[PDB]
Amino acid sequence: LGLFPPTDEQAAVIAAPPGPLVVIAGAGAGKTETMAARVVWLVANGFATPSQVLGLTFTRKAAGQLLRRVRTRLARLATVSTYHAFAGTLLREHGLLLPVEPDTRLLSETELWQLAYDVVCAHPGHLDTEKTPAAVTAMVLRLSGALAEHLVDTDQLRDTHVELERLVHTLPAGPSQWLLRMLATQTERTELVPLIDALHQRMRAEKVMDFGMQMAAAARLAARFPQVGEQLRQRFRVVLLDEYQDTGHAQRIALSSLFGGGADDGLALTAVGDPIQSIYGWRGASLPRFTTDFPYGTPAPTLELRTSWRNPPSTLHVANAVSEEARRVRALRPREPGTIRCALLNNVAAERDWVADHLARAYHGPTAAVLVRRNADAAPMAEALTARGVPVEVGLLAVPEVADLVAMLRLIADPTAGSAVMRILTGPRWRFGARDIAALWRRAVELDLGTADIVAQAAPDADTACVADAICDPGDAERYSPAGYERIVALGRELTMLRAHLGHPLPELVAEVRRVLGLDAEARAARPVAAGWAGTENLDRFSDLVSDFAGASVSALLAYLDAAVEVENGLAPAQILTVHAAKGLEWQVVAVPHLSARVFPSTARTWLTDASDLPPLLRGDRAGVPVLDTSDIYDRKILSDKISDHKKSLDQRRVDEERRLLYVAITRAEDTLLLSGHHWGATESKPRGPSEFLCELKTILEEGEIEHWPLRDQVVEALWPDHVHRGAQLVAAAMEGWAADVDALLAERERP
DNA sequence: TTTCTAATGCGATCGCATTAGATTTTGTT
Length: 752
Ligand code: SF4
Ligand SMILES: [Mg+2]
Hints:
Rossmann fold, six-stranded parallel beta sheet, 12 strands, binds magnesium ion
């Protein structure tokens, strides 16, 4: 009645009776269109209202897609949000049984690093560590985000190296010195326990929290107080747990305590997901238990969705040959055969020319993409594709309109940042030449032996002969070019105007440096004609992050913009996307270009060779994640064999989550699919061989493969130091509503 | 003026000097 016909296998998902129910929805099978097809059957045929619908996904986009596919149906015939927004609401209502304060602020990944580095550099003690601060606060932030993901709380972690150190110093076969290092990493978790515990005593003293503590608190309000769960169960009568294969441990005992731990059988609960696209489990660190954790005391049912819609055959002969014999539920089926083209070339740039030529002979002769494992690898491929004659799509503080705004702001606060003086003296406004830069250094020296003398400097007061106090004192014009002396007086008169504004608020500097600079008039003149009036998106994204910050503009806002270049890779601004980047996007032409060794399989620090990894005795996934025995170990050559076999079991498990990146990057196909992998890398004396996946797939397609069958050491350079010149003649010669607007603007300027 | 890991391949199970790469990345009010 107004839509397409429902499939006969999808009807069991739709017309299932109320109760818990698990669906194994495979790849490309359109799971959302049969999540919304159960909301409609549970509204028009009774059993619920529109207001009693709850859906929970991870990403904020794939909740908005499900938000509309319910309301489009229910208007043709109403509460969808993420997991981490359902935690912040579950602590604004019930968040006083467990004593947290309401209206608690949430720290950014940068403003958390500001606070974590300040409790490491204020620790009274010894620490016995060969590391530096800013490298023992990358272990504090990595255990205390992994202790609050398995719900551990710092007391199960003390004295876990005992009954392992007793195994090496006893049992007389020295202790081989590979086994002391493994013993020295585990007396280092215990050593840093008072750092990841005086950090929580300060985040509770200022009432500010994180994302790994939202779900850690909301899952300790779940299983502890039954009353909070009962109110939620009454409010929502149908609950939709989409993407359940990526649900962590802390998110698992917060849903299985609220929504049906065997409690209610009138609630329509449905949870979808396949075990074989579990790519994200190295971050969340996570379904087989479903039907054992959401029971009636009978176990829960199980159904399947194996018809694949946006995927041709022969990408289901390759994807089913990769996934089977290692992992596999049951194989999925199609409903013309899309082609496969495999290749192997003796150079990266040759293999960047093979994948470009098949992508250029389908554009000048469709929806195309490139799926790469490494973020860095993108750039070269992009340039190559662009160069043939194809248009190509691919940090905020590296944008050249904000970078200039970051650079001339710093030169106002401290005149010892010389690396932001050569951003300005060599920039497009006031282009200096190499003779005037070197004439300013020689003035900057004119304005300026034993252990005590050597340590006298490296102070916060010592004078270092910097350039920026030779612009405010340039001398006489016999040292400079005659056109370059008018610019030193101009930039010295401009800075003294701006340096008197450090008493003003932090935002009104940034709005006055923006006016005095030629910004937001030269940023709009570098955009094409058909783009519109749009020039200042991410130059106005910056100027709301400076006001949401406030602040002192010298220590604050300049040592905040330096952590945020390190910690979160610039900031967030306003196809050659990576393989994690597209998980729900299907194109026509999909190329997976680099399948060499040490690249696509990407080989790795286990729990026994670094501090931060949590020992598998103590995590909530333990028997996967094989925990070692150490009971029959009555020797010391056994202990170097009962552990080295355990490391190879934790390292083969690393490889089984790389086939899942084949099975999730092959089934995004819908058409022809490209596969390649090079033979010489870029900087290797010995060439990198193709990975197992590519030599394995050449044994699948051989039962069409293109002709596969001392490195590249060339130099890349640059030289330092037109319609603009042509368009300047038109304005020189003369000197949509553009006539009356100028008459409006010249009124206010000419009216005192 | 410059760091650190887990490798590799000679020796006298192991020490012991020499050299390649540095991931991927959601989530509030
Ligand atoms: S030219 Fe290259 S090597 Fe020289 S300073 Fe610039 S980035 Fe560094
Ligand atoms: Mg020296």
